Design a protein around this ligand. Structure first.
Ligand SMILES: C/C=C/CC/C=C/CC/C=C/CCCCCCC(=O)OC[C@H](COP(=O)(O)OCCN)OC(=O)CCCCCCC/C=C/C/C=C\CCC
Ligand SMILES: CC(C)(O)CC[C@@H](O)[C@](C)(O)[C@H]1CC[C@@]2(O)C3=CC(=O)[C@@H]4C[C@@H](O)[C@@H](O)C[C@]4(C)[C@H]3CC[C@]12C
Lengths: 238, 233
């Protein structure tokens, strides 16, 4: 089984197992979230935990991934889960984009949306807007398709510059494979548009900034279980 | 096999000239500063000089004078810490695992410790190792620096102009790579790895922000030039 856009495409239509209750996100006992809003935020933490668990089962079944060192596998998911979750939110929220008032709706999951006014209430309006403009809106203008989307996901995960990797080169080969796949696809689906390869990859730095900003908010509200995350990833892959 | 147009070559040559002309502070600037919290003061004072050099490279870039005064500050404040990361990568010595300053003294993990900047040096040196593992040339480096400067940033009044300007530099870089490797498939890998740097310098730039905020909170003597450009509220 080869790492290809074809195989990544058939990996999207597969469902994570319900019995992986891991609390990457949780309202802490130390948290500064007001009493009245503990319930909604706790609910959202639970929704995020479901998705994280889905990304773990996804990552584990990427061609050649399970053949990597176990400690490296843990490091790649640990370094990428937050970016992957925001990327997926941005893909889902393209549907809810309709002078030219700023987008109001962020798709957290099928059926469920987060309204801007609530991000404003929670003091995360700036970042809500950046997800929706630099990611969702941009991916709509660029017309990124599902093939392009799953390619970028794999490239996000397969990061050889992650600190503490054992067989760094074994990740580099997997990522280089993805550059080839992505470039091949772009010259075929869109041979007219010079610059598509670069244009797709310019989303990744934007996603890194947004991801780093969201961690600052998460740690301020004591929503992230930093010490336990590595253990959960090991448990889940096992 | 797509050749470089006269304008792309004129662009490449210009950037290579401005690059080496601005990679080190002037003789007099450097003598004025070294005319002497030792690690801390030389780190902060050299960082002022580095940022001044980045600004002068930026202004010499074609496309920049076409951008409004307000967007120039937006671009420069956002990008200057990221470009600074490329500049240390070029001065990294693998064998001693250290950064070579413009005065030719090697600064280690230890010197940054004593200067209270242990937070920043780990990920910086790792970046340097990964960055000197690539073996990048002067043209990749020059083009990449222009690509970082003309990146999309929050608060831009004309982000489509900036995008159009950056698109020309990305193309020049892509076409320059094709001409180095006779247009084989691996040109996409080389081009992808280079673009991958854009994402790792966003982490380092934000770490630079946090370091500045930390230093201010810990009542350390951080220059106003740097506090200003990096919005150390
Ligand atoms: C990559 C991560 C994706 C995981 C997806 C799961 C989401 C986890 C929780 C994120 C909350 C989204 C904001 C909407 C909050 C809704 C409840 C509300 O209105 O309370 C306001 C309250 C007023 O209190 P207050 O103390 O008066 O607030 C201070 C003044 N505003 O606010 C609070 O008590 C704190 C709310 C928690 C905010 C954490 C946001 C950090 C994550 C940002 C990126 C995630 C994507 C969402 C983009 C918007
Ligand atoms: C909070 C802070 C002051 O911004 C930290 C900056 C610091 O972590 C950096 C990035 O590591 C700085 C400190 C000294 C530095 O400015 C430098 C000192 C130097 O002597 C030269 C000066 C110029 O020639 C630069 O182009 C390169 C170099 C190495 C630069 C690169 C960036 C460095 C290495």
């Amino acid at each position: 089984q080869e790492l290809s856009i074809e195989r990544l495409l058939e990996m999207e239509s597969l469902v994570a197992d319900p019995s992986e209750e891991f609390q990457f996100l949780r309202v802490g006992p130390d948290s500064n979230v007001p009493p009245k809003f503990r319930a909604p935020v706790s609910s959202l933490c639970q929704i995020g935990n479901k998705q994280i668990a889905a990304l773990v089962v996804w990552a584990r079944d990427i061609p050649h991934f399970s053949q990597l060192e176990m400690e490296d596998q843990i490091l790649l998911i640990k370094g990428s889960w937050n970016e992957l979750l925001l990327f997926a939110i941005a893909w889902r929220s393209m549907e809810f984009l309709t002078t030219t008032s700023p987008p109001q709706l962020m798709c957290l999951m099928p059926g469920m949306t987060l309204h801007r006014n609530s991000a404003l209430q929670a003091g995360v309006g700036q970042i809500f807007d950046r997800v929706l403009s630099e990611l969702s809106l941009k991916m709509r203008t660029l017309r990124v398709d599902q093939a392009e989307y799953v390619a970028l996901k794999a490239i996000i995960l397969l990061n050889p510059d992650v600190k503490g990797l054992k067989n760094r080169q074994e990740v580099e080969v997997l990522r280089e494979k993805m550059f080839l796949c992505l470039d091949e696809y772009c010259r075929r689906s869109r041979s007219s548009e010079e610059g598509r390869f670069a244009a797709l990859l310019l989303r990744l730095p934007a996603l890194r900034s947004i991801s780093l900003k969201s961690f600052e908010h998460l740690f301020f509200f004591h929503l992230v279980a930093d010490t336990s995350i590595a253990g959960y990833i090991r448990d889940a892959l096992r | 096999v797509p050749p470089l147009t006269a304008n792309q070559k004129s662009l490449i040559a210009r950037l290579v000239w401005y690059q080496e002309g601005y990679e080190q502070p002037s003789e007099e600037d450097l003598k004025r500063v070294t005319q002497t919290d030792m690690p801390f003061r030389q780190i902060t004072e050299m960082t002022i000089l580095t940022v001044q050099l980045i600004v002068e490279f930026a202004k010499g870039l074609p496309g920049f004078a076409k951008i409004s005064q307000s967007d120039q500050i937006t671009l420069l404040k956002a990008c200057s810490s990221e470009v600074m990361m490329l500049r240390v990568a070029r001065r990294y010595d693998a064998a001693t695992d250290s950064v070579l300053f413009a005065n030719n003294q090697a600064y280690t993990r230890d010197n940054y410790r004593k200067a209270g900047m242990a937070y920043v040096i780990e990920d910086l040196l790792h970046f340097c190792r990964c960055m000197y593992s690539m073996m990048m040339d002067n043209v990749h480096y020059a083009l990449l620096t222009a690509i970082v400067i003309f990146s999309d940033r929050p608060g831009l009044e004309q982000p489509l102009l900036v995008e159009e300007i950056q698109r020309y530099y990305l193309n020049t870089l892509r076409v320059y790579i094709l001409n180095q490797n006779s247009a084989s498939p691996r040109c996409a890998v080389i081009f992808g790895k280079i673009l991958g740097i854009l994402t790792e310098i966003r982490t380092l730039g934000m770490q630079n922000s946090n370091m500045c905020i930390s230093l201010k909170l810990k009542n350390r003597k951080l220059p106003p030039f740097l506090e200003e450009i990096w919005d150390v509220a």
